[PDB]
């Protein structure tokens, strides 16, 4: 509401691969820091 | 059950009141690991 | 699981399952469609259900997920009462409704046949349409050439010369007429001894115009 | 899970869920069976996805593995349009293609019962089969014994006596007679005064050849 | 695989997906039902039935799962033979049969209209009620003013005068009368020459011919 859309990202680590938690073990990171961009649907270069 | 990444784990009266905890209760360290599983 | 929640799977389960769907046909989906119920967005629907108008918006956790229907996707439209199996190109209605549900009571019975004339005990319920009379033969009927299954005094209503042999299935329709009125289906025989034989008899009992 | 990818699980779920599937009854399946779609294998089925005759041949990832049919799951036959629920031993055939269907578009009208009789506003269109006509009693009818909902000129033809009592859904069914020809149902109190009560009527409208 | 077992998922799909229940309408579920078998507990159900009455209890190696029935999912009773769907609210027995499950033979009869008259190959299945014999014009019919669908020897049986115009799905509706006895269909030009046109047909013939 209010146009304050919230985008949720589940981090994926290249070194591990597309790991899926198994045996009740949380997916590992080790990818350091990744910033996930959001592309506005109306405009190719996101206004924001 | 308290597993703490931090070394210090101060106990509280309320837990002892709610259940039963001995004052000189023996504590056995179980090395649960965030990275893996208990070690 | 954590990555894919059991809830994600459960929501998927409702969507995958054929669902009673309310084709109110409102351009805008209602503010509170029932949870775990898909309110179908009409094609050309405005505002909410904007994705894929003509898809079914299923409310899970207050979020309406428009499910893209696939080949033979059956969604029973509550408002119409028809179960619409969307072909894939578009909605395709089933051949029928008004909340009328066709109640069925099982009457398959083995009528031991003794003597040429035996009486079936499967009296129809009052106001119950009979699509057809179901006939089977369970045990060898000895000396039997024909089965005059039908209303007592008028065995002609159902076939009056059905096959009369062990294991013979004489399943059939009692014409285009559906017999709402309660009736027995006496298993008479055309000069055929029925002794030593058993008959499996049912009469498609349907109670139409019965509320859910 | 690492052991089973979310997609591996998804493919399994889609396959297990009842899927309308096309049975063309060929020795060999169509060259491209779509992912999450199957071609029913008739007994004597052979070739790719020929494992188990009487199974369903589904292509996922270029492999046409034949899913074992699950009893109670309706693998409806798209090709013949025939509903087929696996009986566990045979493709049992349920109620039933043609690119055209006897579509249902029930017309809902709520005439207040008035005077002695009110013709229902839910007119049957030409070529509309009436499986049945509902007579919901929205309001208690004052002095009216029954809802005689009948084809015009014949209240007694179907649903002659349905008790006109408040809160009762008096569905009356035209079963022996399917009136495709247009009929304006006439609802009459049974030798009684209709005034003071409300009738909710939905007349089954079934049009054959309806497009998808 | 450990966090979510394959079995958990498999059982979940089998139980939630529409299944033909084997409920015998007993107060208590059978002590040893088949694995993956759905038994709906009837109201006033005593004994076992962990699932509340009105909820399905599915045996899973002796574990009766208390699964709330999915909305829009058919739960045909094996013993009843009735198709009791769950609307997400209440049990409704849908249209049905008594050892005579109806099969609507979708017969697509395509006959080039030639000479003066042609006989369609859509013979009625023996003992099958005909809901409607729809006729479409595959290709424009030269000369013929109108279709004259019917049984051979009668061009007036249903849809006596139809449409020979291109792409016209005119319906020759049998309507109230349905010919259960097997019969072919004949198409003739209306006071004209049939040649130069193609005829398509949508015979809908329900048959109570299958044991259930």
Breaks (C-N over 2.5 A) in chain B follow: none
CA distance C55 to C90: 10
Q: Hunting for tokens 């599937």 — which residue is that?
A: D21
**Which contiguous run of DSSP H or E holds residue D59?**
strand D56-60
CA distance E155 to C24: 42
Q: Kindly determine whether residue E134 and residue D98, on different chains, have CB atoms separated by under 8 Å.
A: yes
Q: Kindly determine whether residue D5 and residue A22, on different chains, have CB atoms separated by under 8 Å.
A: no
Nearest to C199 by CA among C121, C130, C105, C125: C121
Closest chain E C-alpha to D183 CA, distance in angstroms: 13
Rg of chain A over all Cα atoms, to the nearest angstrom: 15
Distances from the Cα of C71 to the Cαs of C111, D64, E75, in angstroms?
A: 45, 19, 22
Helix runs in chain C, H state only? 6-16
Burial class (CB in 10 A: 0-12, 13-18, 19+), D48: middle
Residues of C in contact with A27 (CB under 8 A): 3
- E10: phi then psi, degrees, rounded to nearest 5: -65, -45
**Structure-determination technique:** cryo-EM
CA distance D118 to D128: 21
Residue of E nearest to A25 (CA): E3
Q: Is E183 within 8 Å of E73 (Cβ atoms)?
A: no
Read off the DSSP letter of residue C155: G
Q: Kindly determine whether residue C3 and residue A26, on different chains, have CB atoms separated by under 8 Å.
A: no
C62–A contact, CB cutoff 8 A: no
Burial class (CB in 10 A: 0-12, 13-18, 19+), B14: exposed
The structure tokens listed for C123 are: 């009296």
The structure tokens listed for E195 are: 């040649």
Count CA atoms within 13 Å of residue C124 on its CB side: 25
Distances from the Cα of D172 to the Cαs of D149, D156, D163, in angstroms?
A: 7, 11, 11
Closest chain A C-alpha to D2 CA, distance in angstroms: 5
Count CA atoms within 13 Å of residue A46 on its CB side: 6
CA distance E133 to E107: 9
E3–A contact, CB cutoff 8 A: yes
Which chain A residues have any C-beta within 8 angstroms of a chain D C-beta?
A: 19-22
Residues of D in contact with A21 (CB under 8 A): 1
Q: Is E105 within 8 Å of E128 (Cβ atoms)?
A: yes
Residues of D in contact with C157 (CB under 8 A): none
Rg of chain D over all Cα atoms, to the nearest angstrom: 25
Breaks (C-N over 2.5 A) in chain E follow: 96
Q: How many A×E Cβ pairs under 8 Å?
A: 9
Nearest to D28 by CA among D14, D41, D9, D11: D41
CA distance D127 to D104: 12
Q: How many CB atoms lie within 10 A of CB C47?
A: 10
Nearest to C36 by CA among C74, C63, C3: C63
Q: Is C101 in a helix, a strand, or coil?
A: strand
CA distance E68 to E59: 14
**Which contiguous run of DSSP H or E holds residue D87?**
none
CA distance E179 to C109: 28
Q: Is D209 within 8 Å of E134 (Cβ atoms)?
A: yes
Q: Is E9 in a helix, a strand, or coil?
A: helix
Residue of D nearest to E208 (CA): D95
Residues of D in contact with E173 (CB under 8 A): 127, 129, 180, 208
Read off the DSSP letter of residue C125: P
- What resolution in Å is listed for this PDB structure? 4.5
Identify the sign of the CA torsion D37, D41, D47, D52: positive
Nearest to C192 by CA among C162, C153, C171, C151: C162
Breaks (C-N over 2.5 A) in chain A follow: none
User: Distance between terminal CA atoms of chain B?
Assistant: 16
CA distance D35 to E19: 24
For residue E13, give the nearest of D17, D71, D85 by CB distance.
D17
- Chain C touches chain B, with at least 3 Cβ pairs below 8 Å, answer no
Q: Is D29 within 8 Å of D41 (Cβ atoms)?
A: yes
Closest chain A C-alpha to D3 CA, distance in angstroms: 7
Residues 6+ apart with CB under 8 A from D45: D26, D27, D29, D52, D53, D54, D55, D57
- Beta strand C19-21 pairing with C73-77: parallel
Closest chain D C-alpha to C87 CA, distance in angstroms: 7
Nearest to A18 by CA among D5, C1, D60, D10: D5
Interfacial E residues in 113-142 facing A (CB < 8 Å): none
Closest chain A C-alpha to E185 CA, distance in angstroms: 58
Closest chain E C-alpha to A14 CA, distance in angstroms: 22
Residue of E nearest to C159 (CA): E127
Q: Kindly determine whether residue D3 and residue A21, on different chains, have CB atoms separated by under 8 Å.
A: no
Q: How many CB atoms lie within 10 A of CB A11?
A: 10
């Amino acid at each position: 509401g209010g146009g304050d859309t919230s985008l949720s990202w589940v981090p994926r680590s290249r070194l591990v691969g597309t790991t899926w938690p198994d045996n009740g073990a949380p997916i590992p990171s080790g990818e350091g820091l990744e910033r996930y961009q959001v592309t506005i649907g109306p405009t190719a270069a996101p206004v924001r | 059950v308290i597993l703490a990444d931090t070394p210090a784990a101060t106990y509280t009266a309320a837990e002892r009141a709610a259940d039963g905890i001995a004052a000189p209760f023996r504590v056995a360290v179980s090395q649960i690991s965030e990275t893996t599983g208990p070690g | 699981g954590q990555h894919v929640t059991h809830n994600e799977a459960l929501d998927m389960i409702d969507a995958l399952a054929p669902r009673v769907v309310l084709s109110d046909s409102l351009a805008t989906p209602p503010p509170a469609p029932p949870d775990r119920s898909a309110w179908i967005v009409p094609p050309g629907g405005s505002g909410f259900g904007g994705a894929g108008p003509g898809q079914i918006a299923l409310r899970l956790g207050g979020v309406w997920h428009a499910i893209t229907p696939a080949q033979g996707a059956r969604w029973r439209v509550l408002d119409r009462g028809a179960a619409v199996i969307w072909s894939g190109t578009s909605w395709r209605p089933a051949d029928v409704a008004l909340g009328s549900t066709l109640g069925l009571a099982t009457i398959e019975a083995t009528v031991t046949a003794t003597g040429p004339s035996v009486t079936a005990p499967a009296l129809i319920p009052p106001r119950a349409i009979v699509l057809g009379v179901t006939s089977w033969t369970v045990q060898a009927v000895t000396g039997a050439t024909s089965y005059r299954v039908g209303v007592p005094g008028e065995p002609d209503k159902f076939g009056a010369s059905l096959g009369a042999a062990p294991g013979s299935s004489n399943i059939g329709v009692v014409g285009p007429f559906a017999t709402y009125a309660p009736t027995d289906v006496v298993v008479t025989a055309e000069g055929a001894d029925f002794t030593g034989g058993t008959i499996g008899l049912a009469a498609s009992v349907i109670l139409p115009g019965a509320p859910v």
